[PDB]
Amino acid sequence: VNSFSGYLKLTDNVYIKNADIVEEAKKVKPTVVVNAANVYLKHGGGVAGALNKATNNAMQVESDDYIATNGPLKVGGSCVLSGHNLAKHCLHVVGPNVNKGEDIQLLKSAYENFNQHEVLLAPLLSAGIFGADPIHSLRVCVDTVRTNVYLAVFDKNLYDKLVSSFLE
Ligand SMILES: c1ccc2[nH]ncc2c1
């Protein structure tokens, strides 16, 4: 149904809300939720852990089966697997982990994966355990994504700082 509500329109195609992505997925029934994935699709932490827990581990079971046959993703890459109870599809996107020395330039590649989907519910890529500057990630999103992206930011402080930064 893609019933997004209460987002702040930043650009013609980028929207943001102070919200929990799992609660958004349940409320909105999106066609596509983006996972903040790693290359092995091991969803024990970060947003991936929240989405996997909300699927009662179905996402992890499917991901384990996928990797054993298909091999890992690349940093800046993606795959489309089931959305389980959260969405029709899950776009697993690997942003660079700058806490582990990966090239922040790959954040552009990471966001280019969104352009294959008309509308997405997504987290800010390379935030949290991936260590990237969230203000920078929002700028790469705005400059790279052409399709409609609805960003959910959990932390009110960080949301407020992102909106302030973007309106400068
Ligand atoms: C086949 C199955 C799993 C794999 N992982 N990496 C390469 C590869 C090939």
**Determination technique used:** X-ray
Q: What is the resolution of this structure in A?
A: 1.0
Q: Encoding tokens for residue 166?
A: 């973007």
Does any ligand 1 atom lie closer than 6 A to the CB of residue 71?
Answer: yes
- Among protein residues, the one whose CA lies closest to atom 9 of ligand 1: 71
Residue owning the nearest CA to atom 6 of ligand 1: 71
Q: How far is the CA of 71 from the centre of ligand 1 (A)?
A: 4
Regarding beta strands 78-82 and 89-93, do their DSSP bridges make them parallel or antiparallel, or are they unpaired? antiparallel
